[PDB]
Every structure is written in structure tokens, then in C-alpha cells.
Design a protein around this ligand. Structure first.
Ligand SMILES: [Cl-]
Ligand SMILES: [Mg+2]
Ligand SMILES: [Mg+2]
Ligand SMILES: [Mg+2]
Ligand SMILES: [Mg+2]
Lengths: 194, 194
């Protein structure tokens, strides 16, 4: 019933553009929206986010997360490991690659979502969420070496899956960090499944 | 270690702006980023709220109440938690209950309220509170709920059982050409992983 009529470029940077979207509302009235898009999409989606489940015998299972300075936020954020999918890369391959670059861990694919939207009232950005298990007892994950690209500076924070929400809330209270909404949503549902 | 040096306006619309952000990297080198922000944020602790609405009825399985709407940035329909921006002077909790009633017709009870969490921190400064709300679906006020959408708001309600959320979302994606929100999908995935 609703659809896009036209998209006007307002401003195009190197990485991001701002458009004015004209669309038909369901009453038959024409309306406008200010929309953000990335300039980098080619792909199934802009990026991947990895849910990395660190499995070590006789330990609690952990979810592996990353802490980095985020210039749009003006501060440090706790997130799932994540990055843009390279042209001609599969989401699964982007997931293992980003996980290794950002954390040093080598994981196995468990499942892969369809393309899911990041903030659909604002942008067209999408990701695949890729669940990955990490056999923490294997020798390649003994001393994981993060291989960060240029300008990436990532700290690794592993938190137990069974208390994830309480651990994140503690980090916020004590560290003045911002937790990512996807991370927080995941943590909430671990608690709510009960 | 890292911090913002300057934020230069590139382009400002009615609702969204783009900025050139200069920051200090942990090596001591100046770098730039292209940053998106909303123009609507005042003294709110976040831009918006998203509501996790747990519909509870005797002799029924718990349902998660979701909304489907056309999203001009996406050029299509999206399935999301009920959500909206926080009005000036409004608490996150009040915003939540208000947006839930407006979008779904249901009158909820606050359960929990998250700290401000980031929507897409590599791109934007946008933040929300995630507000968990229970809905007593045996209460007569919640018998035949009618959405009171605002001007230019056109929302469908979709209530799915919590105990099968991920499969039910996958079945909707399989039938109809729509995008699930990343927070919804992350919450559904944790329900499975628990
Ligand atoms: Cl798993
Ligand atoms: Mg990354
Ligand atoms: Mg990376
Ligand atoms: Mg809304
Ligand atoms: Mg609304």
C-alpha cells in the first residue's frame, strides 16, 4: 500500500549520504522523510554482527564482545564484533574474518540471520547477525591475537552468557560506557526466557 | 585515551544532520569520521524508546507484541518493537507506555528500563532506552485494543508467542517481503539460545 516515489540527494560524503525520500502514505497523501544511507553497499546487507559464544570446558559459556571508541557517539561502546562485508564476501566469511581481526578468535558458524535493519526510522542500514561458536579449548584459540586493520583499536571483553545482563549493567554503572542495543536486547532475552 | 576534537556541521535537515567528526586516535594521531545525529534531541537521556511488550494472559503462552510499518529509509515494511522518540520533558517510562498504547492499543505496566543504549554507533549518536513492559491481557482495558496512531503513522500489530518467536519471525519473512529489526532478531535469537 505504501511505496517510494523519489529520492533526492541532500548531501553525500565519503561514507554516508543524506536523502530526502518522497513516499505515498496509505491515505493516498504524498509525504517526505529524511533518510540516511551508506555509500559503501554493493551485498546481502551493509555488514555483519557476530554473536561469539566462547565455549571452554569446566567454565561458564561466555559471549565475546568488543569495546571501542566510536566517534559518532563521542565515547566508548560495548558491541558484538562487527564490520562491513567486503564486495564479493559471503556474510559467513565476513563474520569469521571480523571475529578474528577484532578478537583473535577462530570460530565456527552456527547460524546466520537474514538481512535485519539497524535503525529503520533513520537509515537503510542492514546487517546479518551470525551466531558463531568458539572452541576455547583448541590450540588456535589459546592465545588469540587480534589482527586489527588500520585505525581500529579494539578491546575484547568476554562475559558469562548466564549473567550477561547483570554484567553489562555493572559495566555501564562503573565504566561510563554505552552498551549496544542489539547486545542489550540479546541479554534481556537470556533473562526473559525464564 | 580517545576523544573528540571537533564536530563540523556538513548538512542539517529538519530531522537529521551529518557532521565531520575530528578525533584523537590512541596513537596520538588526528582522524576524521562522518557522523549522523538527530536534530530533535534536547535534554532527553536518549533520543527514543523501544518497548519489549510481554502480553500475559491466563491459560495462554506469553506473547511478544510487535509492530509492522512502512519505513521510508528502508523503502519497505519492517517488523519492530513498538518505539518512538521521547518528547521534551517526558520520562523514558512514560514515553514507552505512551508509544505502546498509541501503536498497539495496549496499556502496559513498567517492568524494567535500560540505560541508554546505542542504535548504530559506527554511524550515528542515536540512543534509546529499551523498556520492558508487561501487558495484563486479562484486564478489560486490554480486551479489544485499538491503536491511536498520530499524524502520518500507520501501524499493524503482530503478537507472537515468546516460546517460538524466532521461527515465527522466519515464517513471516518467508511469506511476505519485509525486514525484521535487528533488536527484535537479537532478542528472538537469545530466546532460542537460552
Ligand atoms: Cl549457540
Ligand atoms: Mg568493527
Ligand atoms: Mg573490523
Ligand atoms: Mg514508532
Ligand atoms: Mg509512535
Amino acid at each position: 500500500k505504501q511505496y517510494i516515489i523519489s529520492e533526492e540527494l541532500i548531501s553525500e560524503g565519503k561514507w554516508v549520504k543524506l536523502e530526502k525520500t518522497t513516499y505515498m502514505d496509505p491515505t493516498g497523501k504524498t509525504r517526505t522523510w529524511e533518510s540516511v544511507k551508506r555509500t559503501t553497499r554493493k551485498q546481502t546487507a551493509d555488514g555483519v554482527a557476530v554473536i561469539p559464544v566462547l565455549q571452554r570446558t569446566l567454565h561458564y559459556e561466555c559471549i565475546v564482545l568488543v569495546k571501542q571508541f566510536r566517534p559518532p557517539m563521542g565515547g566508548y561502546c560495548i558491541e558484538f564484533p562487527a564490520g562491513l562485508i567486503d564486495d564479493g564476501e559471503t556474510p559467513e566469511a565476513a563474520a569469521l574474518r571480523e571475529l578474528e581481526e577484532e578478537t583473535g578468535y577462530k570460530g565456527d558458524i552456527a547460524e546466520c540471520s537474514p538481512a535485519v535493519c539497524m535503525d529503520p526510522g533513520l537509515s537503510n542500514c542492514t546487517i546479518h547477525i551470525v551466531t558463531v561458536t568458539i572452541n576455547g579449548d583448541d590450540a588456535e584459540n589459546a592465545r588469540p591475537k587480534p589482527k586489527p586493520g588500520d585505525g581500529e583499536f579494539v578491546e575484547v571483553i568476554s562475559l558469562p552468557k548466564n549473567d550477561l545482563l547483570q554484567r553489562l549493567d555493572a559495566l555501564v554503572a562503573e565504566e561510563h560506557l554505552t552498551v549496544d542495543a542489539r547486545v542489550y536486547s540479546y541479554a534481556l532475552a537470556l533473562k526473559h526466557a525464564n
